[PDB]
Ligand binder design. Structure first.
Ligand SMILES: Nc1ncnc2c1ncn2[C@@H]1O[C@H](COP(=O)(O)OP(=O)(O)OP(=O)(O)O)[C@@H](O)[C@H]1O
Ligand SMILES: [Mg+2]
Lengths: 198, 983, 202
RNA sequence: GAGAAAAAG
DNA sequence: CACAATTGGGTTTCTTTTTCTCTTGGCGGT
DNA sequence: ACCGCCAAGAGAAAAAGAAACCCAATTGTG
C-alpha cells in the first residue's frame, strides 16, 4: 500500500469509487480511459496534438494544453496520476524531467478541483515500477507495451458497452503504428490498482 | 540562553578594553528592570567586580556586592578574590580585612584554596598575597614543587640525570639571535607581511603610470573615507549603548582605528572579480579581528617585555657564546628560571562573531566610494560605491554575495601590484620557536597554536590532553620542541635556477608551471558546434588548471625569494594520531620536490670519517634507478655516475642534463651539487655539509603488524630479520600478479594487452598496502586506476583485472605468506565493530603517553560504524609509527645530533646517520618489548566493558576482546642487527 | 517588441490601460513574499511566509500543492498577476534543483489563480525578465542585478507612495529584513513599480 | 559551501 | 505497549597541506 | 570604443561502470 502509493487515502474510499480515469501522459501526448471500477469501462480517448513542445518551456503553452485536456475531460469520482522514478541525480535527461514534473504538476493542479473547499487531497500518484511486478511483463528494468494483453482482453477484463465495443475495436484496429500509444499498458494498470481496491 | 551568552561576552570583553564606566551603566540598566534582572547573575557579577578591582577604584565594589546581595545568589570565590584584589593596590586600612577573611571563611570558602582554585591574574594574585602578608604573615603556600618527571619505562633513559649527555649548539651568537627575535617581534605585531613577487616587472609604460597615480590617489581617498565612517559608526554605537544593550562599541574599539582601516583595505584588496558570500567575509573579518586582538593585547598589557626578558634569559641555552650552568632540556629550562603567564582567552560565542562580521562588511560597503567610471572625463560628477551586495545563486543555495564594481576590477588588473600579503602564522619564524611547555602553550610567539589539528569543533581531542596525567604528555611536547629547533636556510643556486625557469615559460614536468600565455586560451553542422563547445570547454578547464598551478608556484617561490640569506625555524604541530606536521603551510619539508630541494640546514656538521659515501648513497636513494639492491652496489653505482654528477653540478641547465628522469629531480640536483662541492676540497672530512640525508622505511605498517605478535614468515619479508639483500613484499606481489597476467595473456583476454607489463611497484603500492587494512574493492580500483592515469602508455582503462587479481586471486597467496597478521586485522575489526554497537568511540593510549580518539560521528551525536571498524587499524598503527618516531627523536637529541623527521622518513647530517640508525633500531626494540596488545586489551576492557548496559553486549565483547593472537617464534632483539630496516 | 521584451505573455494594451488591481510576488527557494500595489500609487498589503517543509531532499507534488494552497489562502484576487522569472537557463548544469524548483512553482501557481480561464479565454498571469525590470532602473553592472535594498529603502522612506495605514508595520518589519539578508521581498515592490511605469501610464 | 585540479604519508 | 525478521539506499582504509572559479562566448554593424 | 544583447532545444550524447555491503526501516506478530 505505502510502497505502491506514495500518498495515502482511506481504504473505503479506495475500494469503492463510481468512476475513475487514467491520467497517464507520454512525451508526445496524453491518453485517458474512463474506468468505472465495476470492470465495465466507458470511454477512452487521447489528445490529438501537443503544441507545448515547440519553442521553449513557457507557462502559456502549458496552460493552452491543460485547458484543452481538462476541457475534453469527463467527470470521475477518483483520479489516478502516474509517478515516474526519474532520478534527480542523473545529469542527463533533464528536459524530460522538467516535462514530466511540470506536466504532472499542472495535471495535479487543474484536474484536482475543490482542494481549498474540501480538505481531501483527491488525486494520488502511483508507483509504476512496483505495479510492473504485478504485470510480470519483464525483469523490471524496462516496461514493455501492454497492447498484447489488451488484445487478449478483447478483439475479458475490459467489458466495453455493446454500443462502444465495436467502435473501440475499430479504432484500436485503425491505430496500430502510432508507436506513442504505449500508455495502453497503463490503461490496464488501474485494473491492477483495483487489486488494491478489491 | 543565547542572550545570556552575548551579555557574558560583552561584560567579559569590556575588561580587555578600558571602558569600565561604560560597563557600569549597562549593568545598572539591566539590574534596574526585573525583566532585565533575569540572566544577569550568571557569572558576570564577579567579572565586573574583577573589572573594578583591576582599576584603582575600591569604593565601587561595595555597590557591586550590594547588587549581588540584591540578586540573592551566593557570592563566588572569584568575588572574594576580587575583594582581596581591591584591598590590594591601595593603602591598607589595617582593620576589618581580617573581618573580611573571617566572613569569607564562613559559608565554606577557604583562604588557602583561592590561590589555586580561582585562577585569577597572577600579578593580582601577588597583590592579594601582599595584602594577606600585610594582614598576617602566617600563611604562604610554596608553588615551587620540584619539576615532575615521567615514570614510564620507555622514556626513563631520556629523563635520567646520570650519564654522559651532549646537546646540539646553534651556530649564531647570542646577540644575533636577539636581533632576529626583535625582527620577528616587529614582523608579528603587524600581522600582514609584504612579499616582493617573483613575477617579472614587465614594461613600465605611461598607462601603467597613470593607473598607479590614480590608484594611489583614490587609495588615500578611501582610507580617509573608511576612517570617517568608522568614527561616525562608533559614535553611533556609543550613543546606542547608553539606551540599549549588546551595543558594539567596546567590540569595535577593541583595536585601534589604524589597524582596522588597514584590515578593511586588505580585505578589499583580496576580493577576486567574483565576490564571495557575505557570511564568508563576515567570518573572515571577525576571525581576523580576534587574531589581531590576541596579537595586540600583549603590547598594552605588558607581557611582551616580560616575554623578551625571559627569552633573553632562555636563549643562552642555544647560544654558542653563552654557557648554561648545567645542561638540560629546552623545555625544562623554560619550566624553571621563571615562568610566563598565559591568559588563554576563550573566544566569544558565534552570534557575536557573525554579527560583528556583518557590521564590518556593511561598513566597508557604505564607506568605500569610487568616482564615476575609470575614464579620464569626470562629467557625471558622482561617486558610486565600489562593492554592492548581490543576490546570487552560488551552487546549491541562494546566498548573498559582495560584488566589486567592474571598473575597480579593470583598474586593479591594470596595475601590476607586485606586493603579496601573507599571514604571520604562514610565514616561518625568524627566531627559534617557543618551547612546548604545555598543550595550552604554543610554538608561536604572540599567537596561539593548537596541539592537535582538527577540522571543525572536535573538542574531545584536546579534552583528552587536558585530562591526561601531567607527566605523560611531557615526552611528546619535548619531541615537538625538538622538531621546532631545526635551523633552516634556502639554497642560493637552486632558488636562482628555479626562478630563472619561472620567469620564462619553463618546463612543467619539473613542477614549475608556465605563464598562461603558453597555456591554450557560420557553423556547417550541429556536430561541428558540439565539437567547438567541447574544445572551448577543454581549453577553459586546461587554462584554469594551469593558472591554478601557477598561482601556488608564485605564492611559494615569492616567499622563498623573500627568505634568502636568513635563518629559519619551522614549528611543528600534531595530528590526532600523533603524527607531526609543520605549522607553516606554504614552505616546509612536507611539500614537493622543489620545496624539499630549497631547504638546507643552517648549521653544518663536518662530514666525519664516514662522510661522503653516505651522501652519495642518499643521491642514489633519490635517483630511483636502484632501490632493490644493497648499499655497496649503491655506492658503486654512485661511483660510476660521477662524471654526470660533476657535469650537472657545474652547469645545471645549459650543459649535459642528468638530474632529469629521477623521481625527485631537484633534490637530486641539490645532493649532486653538495657532493661535487664536497669532493673539491683538500680534506673531505673537514668540509662543512648543510645537506639533509634521508632514511626511509621499507614497508613500515607491515613491519609494525609483524612486531605486534612475532612471525617467522612475513616479518622476514619486511626486512625485520637481518638480511644482506633487501626484501620487498610489493615487488613479490607485483611479480605474482604479472605471472598470472602472462597466463591470462596466453589465454587471450583483451585486457592483458592493455596492461602490457606496465605494472610496477608504484602501480600496486597503495592497494597491496591497504590489503592489510580493511579494504573494499572500490577503494582498490580508485588507486589502481589513478596510477595508470598518470602513466601515458595505454589510453582506455578498465582496471578491474588488477583489483580482481589483487584482493581476490593473489589474496589466496596473500593469505599464504601473510598468516597471523590478518588474524590481528580481524580481531581489531571485530573489537571496533562491537565498540560501535555498544555506542562508544575507540580510545587508545600510545606507549609514549599520547591518547588517541577517533572523530567519526553520525550527523549527543552517535558514532558511525562504517568509518570506525574500518579506519581503526590505519589510525592506531600510525600512532605506533609516531611513538617510534618520537622515541627516535629523543634518543637522537641526547647524543648531540640535530634531527628533523618527515614521518617515516628521518633526516640527519652526513656524519650522524649511523648513530641515528642505531637509535632507530634501539627504539623499535624498546617500544615493542612492552606488550602493546595485552595492555591494549586491558585498556579496552576497562573502558568499553566496565558498565553493565546489557548481558549480551558485555559477554560477547568480553569473549572477543580477551583473546589476543599468539606471537610466533621470532626474537625482536634481532632488529638491532637488522641492516636494512630503515634504509 | 519592447513590451514583448518585458512581458512574456502577450496582453494587448487596452486592458492594460486600467488594471485597477495588481499583485506582485517573488519566488524564493527558502522563503516566499508578496505585495499588492494597484495601477495607482496605493499599496494594499505586504507579507512574507517562512518555514517551508521543502527543498529537504525529496520532491513530491502533493506537499507542493499543499504549500501553494497554504500560500494562496492568504492571497487576494486581482486583475493581473506579476511573476519574476529567473535569469537561469536550462543549459546551466549547476543550480539545476533551484531551476526545477522555480519552474515547478511557477507552473503550479500559474496553473492556479485563474478560476475563469475557460470562460474568458484570455491569460491572466504575466511574468517578468529580472534583467529587464532591473533595466528600467540603473541597478545592473556587468549584466547582474544588485540588491536594490538601498533603492527600496529610499523609495519606501514620488516614485511610490505607501499608505499610512500599514506603514508602521512596514517599517518595523523592514528593520528586521534589513538586518537579515532577505532580498526576495525587496524586488517585489521594484518590479511592481516598473510594471506600472513601463507598460502602464505611457 | 560545493566544484576544477595539484603535492606529501 | 512491545517487538520484529526481512528489504532497499548511501558508502566504499586512512591522514595532511595548496591554488583557482561559482558556465560565458559570441555577434553586432555605429 | 562601449554598452547592447542574447538566446541559448529536446540532440542521441546515453559515461563510466558495477559489486558488495551493511544499517536502519515496515507492514506483520504476540
Ligand atoms: N593512502 C594511504 N592510506 C593509508 N596509509 C598510508 C597511505 N599512504 C601511506 N600510508 C602509510 O605510510 C606508511 C608506509 O607508506 P609509504 O608510502 O611511506 O611506504 P614505504 O614503506 O616508504 O615504501 P617504499 O619504501 O617501498 O616506497 C604506512 O604506515 C602506511 O600505513
Ligand atoms: Mg617509508
Amino acid at each position: 500500500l505505502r510502497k505502491l502509493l506514495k500518498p495515502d487515502i482511506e481504504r473505503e474510499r479506495l475500494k469503492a469509487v463510481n468512476s475513475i480515469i487514467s491520467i497517464v501522459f507520454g512525451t508526445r501526448r496524453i491518453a485517458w480511459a474512463h474506468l468505472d471500477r465495476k470492470l465495465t469501462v466507458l470511454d477512452w480517448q487521447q489528445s490529438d496534438r501537443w503544441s507545448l513542445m515547440r519553442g521553449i518551456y513557457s507557462s502559456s503553452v502549458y496552460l493552452e494544453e491543460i485547458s484543452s485536456i481538462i476541457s475534453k475531460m469527463p467527470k470521475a469520482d477518483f483520479y489516478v496520476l502516474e509517478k515516474t522514478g526519474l532520478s534527480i541525480q542523473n545529469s542527463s535527461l533533464f528536459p524530460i524531467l522538467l516535462h514530466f514534473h511540470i506536466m504532472e504538476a499542472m495535471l495535479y493542479a487543474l484536474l484536482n478541483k475543490t482542494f481549498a473547499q474540501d480538505g481531501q487531497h483527491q488525486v494520488l500518484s502511483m508507483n509504476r515500477n512496483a505495479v510492473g511486478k504485478h504485470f510480470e511483463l519483464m525483469i523490471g528494468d524496462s516496461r514493455t507495451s501492454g497492447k498484447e494483453l489488451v488484445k487478449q482482453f478483447l478483439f475479458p477484463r475490459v467489458f466495453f458497452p455493446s454500443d462502444k465495443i465495436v467502435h473501440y475495436r475499430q479504432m484500436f484496429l485503425s491505430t496500430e503504428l502510432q508507436r506513442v500509444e504505449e500508455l495502453y499498458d497503463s490503461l490496464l494498470q488501474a485494473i491492477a490498482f483495483y487489486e488494491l481496491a478489491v | 540562553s543565547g542572550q545570556q551568552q552575548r551579555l557574558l561576552a560583552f561584560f567579559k570583553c569590556c575588561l580587555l578594553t578600558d571602558q569600565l564606566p561604560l560597563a557600569h551603566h549597562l549593568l545598572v540598566v539591566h539590574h534596574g528592570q526585573r525583566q532585565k534582572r533575569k540572566l544577569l547573575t550568571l557569572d558576570m557579577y564577579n567579572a565586573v567586580m574583577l573589572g573594578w578591582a583591576r582599576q584603582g577604584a575600591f569604593k565601587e565594589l561595595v555597590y557591586v556586592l550590594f547588587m549581588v546581595k540584591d540578586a540573592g545568589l551566593t557570592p563566588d570565590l572569584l568575588s572574594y578574590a576580587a575583594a582581596l584584589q581591591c584591598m590590594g593596590r591601595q593603602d591598607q586600612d589595617a582593620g576589618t580585612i581580617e573581618r573580611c577573611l573571617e566572613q569569607m571563611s564562613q559559608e565554606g570558602l577557604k583562604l588557602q584554596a583561592l590561590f589555586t582554585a580561582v585562577l585569577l591574574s597572577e600579578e593580582d594574585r601577588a597583590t592579594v598575597l601582599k595584602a594577606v602578608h600585610k594582614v598576617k604573615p602566617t600563611f604562604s603556600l610554596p608553588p615551587q614543587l620540584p619539576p615532575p618527571v615521567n615514570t614510564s619505562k620507555l622514556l626513563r633513559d631520556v629523563y635520567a640525570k646520570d650519564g654522559r649527555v651532549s646537546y646540539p649548539k646553534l651556530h649564531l651568537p647570542l646577540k644575533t639571535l636577539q636581533c632576529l627575535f626583535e625582527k620577528q617581534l616587529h614582523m608579528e605585531l603587524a600581522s600582514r607581511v609584504c612579499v616582493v613577487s617573483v613575477e617579472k616587472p614587465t614594461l613600465p609604460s605611461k598607462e601603467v603610470k597613470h593607473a598607479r597615480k590614480t590608484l594611489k590617489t583614490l587609495r588615500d581617498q578611501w582610507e580617509k573615507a573608511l576612517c570617517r565612517a568608522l568614527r561616525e559608526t562608533k559614535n553611533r554605537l556609543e550613543r546606542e549603548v547608553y539606551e540599549g544593550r549588546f551595543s558594539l562599541y567596546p567590540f569595535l574599539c577593541l583595536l585601534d582605528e589604524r589597524e582596522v582601516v588597514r584590515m578593511l583595505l586588505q580585505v578589499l584588496q583580496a576580493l577576486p572579480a567574483q565576490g564571495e558570500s557575505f557570511t564568508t567575509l563576515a567570518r573572515e573579518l571577525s576571525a581576523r579581528t580576534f587574531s589581531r586582538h590576541v596579537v595586540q593585547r600583549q603590547r598594552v598589557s605588558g607581557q611582551v617585555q616580560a616575554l623578551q626578558n625571559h627569552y633573553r634569559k632562555y636563549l643562552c641555552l642555544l647560544a654558542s657564546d653563552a654557557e648554561v650552568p648545567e645542561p638540560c632540556l629546552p623545555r625544562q629550562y623554560w619550566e624553571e628560571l621563571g615562568a610566563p603567564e598565559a591568559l588563554r582567552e576563550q573566544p566569544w560565542p558565534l552570534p557575536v562573531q557573525m554579527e560583528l562580521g556583518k557590521l564590518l562588511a556593511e561598513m566597508l560597503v557604505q564607506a568605500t566610494q569610487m568616482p564615476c567610471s575609470l575614464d579620464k572625463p569626470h562629467r557625471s560628477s558622482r561617486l558610486v560605491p565600489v562593492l554592492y551586495h548581490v543576490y546570487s545563486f552560488r551552487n546549491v543555495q541562494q546566498i548573498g554575495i559582495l560584488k566589486p564594481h567592474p571598473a575597480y576590477v579593470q583598474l586593479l588588473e591594470k596595475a601590476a601590484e607586485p606586493t603579496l600579503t601573507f599571514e604571520a602564522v604562514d610565514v616561518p619564524m625568524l627566531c627559534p620557536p617557543l618551547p612546548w611547555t604545555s598543550p595550552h602553550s604554543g610554538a608561536f610567539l604572540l599567537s596561539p597554536t593548537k596541539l592537535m589539528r582538527t577540522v571543525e569543533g572536535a573538542t574531545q581531542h584536546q579534552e583528552l590532553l587536558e585530562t591526561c596525567p601531567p607527566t605523560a604528555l611531557h615526552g611528546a611536547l619535548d619531541a615537538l620542541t625538538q622538531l621546532g629547533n631545526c635551523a633552516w636556510r634556502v639554497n642560493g643556486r637552486v632558488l636562482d635556477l628555479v626562478l630563472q625557469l619561472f620567469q620564462a615559460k619553463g618546463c612543467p614536468q619539473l613542477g614549475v608551471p608556465a605563464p598562461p600565455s603558453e597555456a591554450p586560451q557560420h557553423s556547417a553542422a550541429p556536430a561541428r558546434k558540439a565539437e567547438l563547445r567541447r574544445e572551448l570547454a577543454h581549453c577553459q578547464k586546461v587554462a584554469r588548471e594551469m593558472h591554478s598551478l601557477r598561482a601556488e608556484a608564485l605564492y611559494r617561490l615569492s616567499l622563498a625569494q623573500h627568505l634568502r640569506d636568513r635563518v629559519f625555524w619551522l614549528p611543528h604541530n600534531m595530528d590526532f594520531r600523533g603524527r607531526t606536521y609543520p605549522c607553516p603551510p606554504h614552505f616546509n619539508h612536507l611539500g614537493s620536490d622543489v620545496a624539499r630541494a630549497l631547504l638546507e640546514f643552517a648549521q653544518g656538521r663536518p662530514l666525519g670519517p664516514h662522510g661522503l659515501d653516505w651522501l652519495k648513497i642518499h643521491l642514489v636513494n633519490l635517483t630511483g634507478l636502484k632501490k632493490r639492491e644493497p648499499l655497496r652496489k649503491r655506492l658503486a653505482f654512485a661511483e660510476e655516475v660521477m662524471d654526470d654528477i660533476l657535469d650537472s653540478a657545474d652547469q645545471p641547465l645549459t650543459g649535459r642534463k642528468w638530474w632529469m628522469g629521477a623521481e625527485e629531480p631537484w633534490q637530486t640536483l641539490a645532493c649532486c651539487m653538495e657532493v661535487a662541492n664536497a669532493v673539491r676540497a683538500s680534506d673531505p672530512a673537514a668540509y662543512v655539509s648543510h645537506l639533509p640525508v634521508h632514511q626511509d622505511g621499507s614497508c613500515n605498517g607491515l613491519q609494525h603488524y609483524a612486531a605486534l605478535g612475532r612471525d617467522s614468515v612475513g616479518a622476514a619479508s619486511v626486512n625485520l630479520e637481518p638480511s644482506d639483500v633487501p626484501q620487498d613484499v610489493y615487488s613479490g606481489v607485483a611479480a605474482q600478479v604479472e605471472v598470472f597476467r602472462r597466463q591470462d595473456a596466453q589465454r587471450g583476454m583483451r585486457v592483458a594487452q592493455v596492461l602490457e607489463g606496465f605494472i610496477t611497484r608504484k602501480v600496486v603500492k597503495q592497494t597491496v598496502m591497504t590489503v592489510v587494512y580493511g579494504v573494499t574493492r572500490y577503494g582498490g580500483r580508485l588507486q589502481i586506476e589513478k596510477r595508470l592515469r598518470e602513466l601515458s602508455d595505454f589510453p582506455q582503462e578498465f582496471v578491474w583485472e588488477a583489483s580482481h587479481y589483487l584482493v581476490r586471486q593473489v589474496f589466496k597467496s596473500l593469505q599464504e605468506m601473510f598468516s597471523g597478521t590478518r588474524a590481528i586485522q580481524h580481531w581489531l575489526t571485530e573489537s571496533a565493530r562491537l565498540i560501535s554497537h555498544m555506542g562508544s568511540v575507540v580510545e587508545w593510549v600510545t606507549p609514549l603517553g599520547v591518547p588517541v580518539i577517533q572523530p567519526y560521528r553520525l550527523d549527543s551525536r552517535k558514532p558511525n560504524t562504517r568509518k570506525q571498524k574500518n579506519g581503526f587499524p590505519p589510525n592506531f598503527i600510525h600512532s605506533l609509527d609516531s611513538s617510534h618516531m618520537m622515541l627516535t627523536a629523543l634518543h637522537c637529541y641526547r647524543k648531540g645530533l640535530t634531527f628533523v623527521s618527515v614521518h617515516d622518513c628521518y633526516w640527519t647530517h652526513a656524519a650522524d646517520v649511523s648513530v641515528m640508525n642505531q637509535v632507530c633500531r634501539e627504539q623499535f626494540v624498546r617500544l615493542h618489548s612492552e606488550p602493546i596488545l595485552q595492555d591494549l586489551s586491558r585498556f579496552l576492557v576497562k573502558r568499553f566493558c566496565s558498565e553493565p548496559q546489557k548481558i549480551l553486549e558485555a559477554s560477547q565483547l568480553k569473549e572477543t576482546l580477551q583473546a589476543v593472537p599468539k606471537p610466533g617464534a621470532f626474537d625482536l632483539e634481532q632488529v638491532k642487527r637488522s641492516t636494512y630496516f630503515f634504509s
